[PDB]
Amino acid sequence: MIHELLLALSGYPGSIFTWNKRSGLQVSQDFPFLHPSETSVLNRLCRLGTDYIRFTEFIEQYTGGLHGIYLRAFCTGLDSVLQPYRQALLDLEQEFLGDPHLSISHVNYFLDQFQLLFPSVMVVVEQIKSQKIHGCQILETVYKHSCGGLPPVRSALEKILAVCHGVMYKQLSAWM
Amino acid sequence: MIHELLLALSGYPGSIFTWNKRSGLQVSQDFPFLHPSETSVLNRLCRLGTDYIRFTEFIEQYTGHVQQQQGQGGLHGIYLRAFCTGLDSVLQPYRQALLDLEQEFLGDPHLSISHVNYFLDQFQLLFPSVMVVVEQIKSQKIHGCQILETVYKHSCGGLPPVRSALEKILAVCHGVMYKQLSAWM
Amino acid sequence: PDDRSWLEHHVVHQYWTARPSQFPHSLHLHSNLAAVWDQHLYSSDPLYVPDDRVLVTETQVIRETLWLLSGVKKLFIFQLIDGKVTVRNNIIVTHLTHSCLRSVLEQIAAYGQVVFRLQEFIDEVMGPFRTYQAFMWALYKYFISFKEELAEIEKCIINTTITLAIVVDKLAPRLSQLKVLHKVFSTGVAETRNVVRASHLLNTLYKAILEYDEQTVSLLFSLWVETVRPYLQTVDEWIVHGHLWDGAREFIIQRTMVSFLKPVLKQIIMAGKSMQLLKNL
Amino acid sequence: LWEAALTYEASKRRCWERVGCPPGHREEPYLTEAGRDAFDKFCRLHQGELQLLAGGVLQAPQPVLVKECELVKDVLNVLIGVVSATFSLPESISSLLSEVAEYGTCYTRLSHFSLQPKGLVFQAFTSGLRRYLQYYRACVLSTPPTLSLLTIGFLFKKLGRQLRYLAELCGVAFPTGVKLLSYLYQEALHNCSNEHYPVLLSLLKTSCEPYTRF
Amino acid sequence: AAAAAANLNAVRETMDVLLEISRILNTGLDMETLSICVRLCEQGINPEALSSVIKELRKATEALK
Amino acid sequence: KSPNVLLQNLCCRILGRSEADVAQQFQYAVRVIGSNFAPTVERDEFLVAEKIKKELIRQRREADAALFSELHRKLHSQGVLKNKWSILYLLLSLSEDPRSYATLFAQALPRDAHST
């Protein structure tokens, strides 16, 4: 249970958090020890998991229609923004092995900064797919949201952006 | 597990690793506590020992058993004895590696089966290459200088260990021809 | 006691042998989840017919997957169907509700099909082609360093917790590299004659290096050098020794096709033939 | 006393399933990775199952002991020439043991052929045979004090096969005089490039030292 | 046994949480002194009385330093 | 062990001196600890948790009070201790700055309304 949640967070939810193709991780299972209102808490948490699940598919196809080398670079920075999302998941199970009294609230406050990171990066990911931004105009489409206004999305899209600039110094070295 | 494996690998057959010429070396396979995970590692390891027993058996059978006198040159002759003489010096780094592993097992006897499988499968490629080269010479009764060709065609290969290994034996087999040529000319 | 105790200590046969495995631990739901989920089913009155479960313990799944990833088989979990490993639906650890398990062991199984196929390919060269044989040699040299990591993890089980999410993230720069060969090989088994089946495979590498001009490029570069070595030798023998030897017509020049030598090919042929014409004077 | 014991380091081998204090208690070690005692137990257990499948007619008492160094000292005494407790005139040990044991048994039949101080050239030839036997008894106890068991078989391989070649040379009919002087020359023409070239040459070189005096 | 080590482990964990509470207040006491002060209060003792000797002795290890 | 030698161990801990070099301080120690070999008040472990909070806010070290809020849970979670009041009251008594009034703040239950 302290790995089922910490895998439903990652990419494997089982039958408690049944995945739906539109948006998944649905719960209807009953327990006396999970509070009747705690289903709403878990529903608040599953928003975080769905975005990571979609991110993994998007990285799975890369690294015609939409293609290039930028989709093999922009996804690679999307790895680097997700790395403190993996490290802080390992740290959690390490803590839960020792102390059994920590509840759902610990993962909730501890990973509360990705409820600003995940939606505001997810909108950029959806925008680049629904629109046809797949040449060297990718740096602009991220360059408007990298300014941010919330600090997680202010720091993440920069880390992705630097590699896209790095592709722009290999075209402009062969040319120049 | 420990010393029995190396005795089998060195070409001293075990009663755990029962030497056959119908199934090669084979573990007893009747202890109910041998892990089936271990079984495949043993199957990969036993091929090396089977090829090594074939090598030592060929060398003992054809060199030192007489005073260099059948009269078929694929079974006798100075060139053929010289092949065995080159072949045991080719087998030298296998000896070095086995000696090293025994020292490591003496230092700690808790080493893994994957460890000995990983270290010694640099010979896993070289051992299948040389078998057809010796098998051709024995079967076709190859005599004299045609043995040099039989080794020479497989020493121009695309596996570098096989290339170096067979080059040494062709140098050895040239030596006896040079010994006769140094008088006749 | 005396011999049975020696057995009971150093054997892990509870899934290698028919005996329901038990681990003595702290129980109560945080690790008792499978039992909790069964009890929830029964309290909801299904009425019965549960799943096939026989309970393995936690670390043993990891030992099992590490053996599959290093390359060996005869493995109870990840049962074969004709050579292809498939997820086992008759076992559970003590948690993961028997359906999450079916997903995550399936993803390791999906990697294991690739590894079994690569070892199957390397197996089918020992029982020359001058490029295919040269390619399995590079694949094998990489496979050595790949096997070393699986062995070192397997040692330190006896020497930290052992669980799934640590080992999956631990093998990230290998489970990435496994997918590139899945794409390289599809053009290498697309295949008529030995020289076009080889030029196809070689030209795939020659393209993919220009594609990313990471770690993937080191992989492809290590595949590229160790496949053109027989050709560099064969070019040198035709050039300096004069005579053309290209029997079985595996040499790409016959007195797809790679552009590794196309801008200088006129000078190559006019060098070799003229050396042969130097031998006749 | 309690606080004095308290200052210790607690074990790792953490377990996932223990949530209530998982320090470590070893989730069942691996069979090979507990070696050097499991090894001899496993050989003994197999020997017991083998003896069961026959009925006690494959019974060989002391399946363990001699271990390694005792077995090495035993084979060192056999390499001096003298016989052991098992020779009259661990179960893979027999296959390794036979290869060096036969070397000892043919070494003794050369020393028995050097009991002499009949042929004049035969005496000088025997005095040359002792020049190799002295090497064979001198190299043992200066190279192998109590070294590794496989090391002895590998080390006396390059030297032992030559001794077996000399065992084919001696008769133990056997000629004497100028017949022996011709017999050795035909042995010179038979083999000239294996390893036995300086040895056969050095025997032949003193087998003709008295004949030139004539 | 195992429960004879589980208790000695179970008091080490608490003693280190107490040591963290001891260092975030940053009292000048260390673990060896703390080992006496824990043992004294299991038999029962007045904390206002032990604080009196410690508040005397820490200013007496400077007049005799 | 026994309490009397344990106090001598305390005297050799704080002072650098050994027990065969000082005897007036151990005499002062038997004077002060004596007839106070138990708490003279009633325990209120909740209030002494609140006093570490009321102290760390008073220092404006407000983050370590919220750290203590989790260490106190660890104290309950392990539960090898039946005297959590004594050591924590003592640790509060030996208070030192990492770097007002308590005459209106509540004190420990004195048992002046009960025959001791």
Swiss-Prot record, chain A:
It is found in: Cytoplasm, Cytoskeleton, Microtubule organizing center, Centrosome. Ubiquitously expressed. It comes from the Eukaryota. Belongs to the TUBGCP family. It is linked to Microcephaly and chorioretinopathy, autosomal recessive, 3: A disorder characterized by congenital microcephaly and chorioretinal dysplasia associated with poor vision and nystagmus. Variable ocular anomalies include microphthalmia, retinal folding, retinal detachment, optic nerve hypoplasia, absence of retinal vessels, round areas of chorioretinal atrophy, and attenuated electroretinogram. Most patients have mild developmental delay and mild learning difficulties. Component of the gamma-tubulin ring complex (gTuRC) consisting of TUBGCP2, TUBGCP3, TUBGCP4, TUBGCP5 and TUBGCP6 and gamma-tubulin TUBG1 or TUBG2. TUBGCP2, TUBGCP3, TUBGCP4, TUBGCP5 and TUBGCP6 assemble in a 5:5:2:1:1 stoichiometry; each is associated with a gamma-tubulin, thereby arranging 14 gamma-tubulins in a helical manner. Gamma-tubulin at the first position is blocked by TUBGCP3 at the last position, allowing 13 protafilaments to grow into a microtubule. This is Gamma-tubulin complex component 4. It comes from Homo sapiens. The chain holds residues 1 to 191 of 667 of the full protein.
Swiss-Prot record, chain C:
It is found in: Cytoplasm, Cytoskeleton, Microtubule organizing center, Centrosome. Widely expressed, with highest levels in heart and skeletal muscle and moderate levels in brain. It comes from the Eukaryota. Component of the gamma-tubulin ring complex (gTuRC) consisting of TUBGCP2, TUBGCP3, TUBGCP4, TUBGCP5 and TUBGCP6 and gamma-tubulin TUBG1 or TUBG2. TUBGCP2, TUBGCP3, TUBGCP4, TUBGCP5 and TUBGCP6 assemble in a 5:5:2:1:1 stoichiometry; each is associated with a gamma-tubulin, thereby arranging 14 gamma-tubulins in a helical manner. Gamma-tubulin at the first position is blocked by TUBGCP3 at the last position, allowing 13 protafilaments to grow into a microtubule. Belongs to the TUBGCP family. Component of the gamma-tubulin ring complex (gTuRC) which mediates microtubule nucleation. The gTuRC regulates the minus-end nucleation of alpha-beta tubulin heterodimers that grow into microtubule protafilaments, a critical step in centrosome duplication and spindle formation. This is Gamma-tubulin complex component 5. The gene is TUBGCP5.
From Swiss-Prot, chain D:
Signal peptide: none annotated. It comes from the Eukaryota. It is found in: Cytoplasm, Cytoskeleton, Microtubule organizing center, Centrosome. Component of the gamma-tubulin ring complex (gTuRC) consisting of TUBGCP2, TUBGCP3, TUBGCP4, TUBGCP5 and TUBGCP6 and gamma-tubulin TUBG1 or TUBG2. TUBGCP2, TUBGCP3, TUBGCP4, TUBGCP5 and TUBGCP6 assemble in a 5:5:2:1:1 stoichiometry; each is associated with a gamma-tubulin, thereby arranging 14 gamma-tubulins in a helical manner. Gamma-tubulin at the first position is blocked by TUBGCP3 at the last position, allowing 13 protafilaments to grow into a microtubule. It is linked to Microcephaly and chorioretinopathy, autosomal recessive, 1: A syndrome characterized by microcephaly, cognitive impairment, underdeveloped retina and choroid, and epilepsy in some patients. The more anterior parts of the retina, near the periphery and pars plana, have a grayish hue and diminutive vasculature similar to retinopathy of prematurity. Visual impairment becomes evident during the first year of life. Belongs to the TUBGCP family. This is Gamma-tubulin complex component 6. It comes from Homo sapiens (Human). The gene is TUBGCP6.
From Swiss-Prot, chain E:
Belongs to the MOZART1 family. Its main location: cytoplasm. Transmembrane segments: none annotated. One of its GO terms (biological process) is microtubule nucleation by interphase microtubule organizing center. It comes from the Eukaryota. The keyword Acetylation applies. GO terms for cellular component: centrosome; cytosol; gamma-tubulin ring complex; interphase microtubule organizing center; spindle. The keyword Cytoplasm applies. Required for the recruitment and the assembly of the gamma-tubulin ring complex (gTuRC) at the centrosome. The gTuRC regulates the minus-end nucleation of alpha-beta tubulin heterodimers that grow into microtubule protafilaments, a critical step in centrosome duplication and spindle formation. Associates with the gamma-tubulin ring complex (gTuRC) consisting of TUBGCP2, TUBGCP3, TUBGCP4, TUBGCP5 and TUBGCP6 and gamma-tubulin TUBG1 or TUBG2; within the complex, interacts with TUBGCP3 and TUBGCP6 to form a luminal bridge with actin that stabilizes the initial structure during complex assembly. Interacts with TUBG1. It is found in: Cytoplasm, Cytoskeleton, Microtubule organizing center, Centrosome; Cytoplasm, Cytoskeleton, Spindle. Keywords: Acetylation, Cytoplasm, Cytoskeleton. This is Mitotic-spindle organizing protein 1. It comes from Homo sapiens (Human).
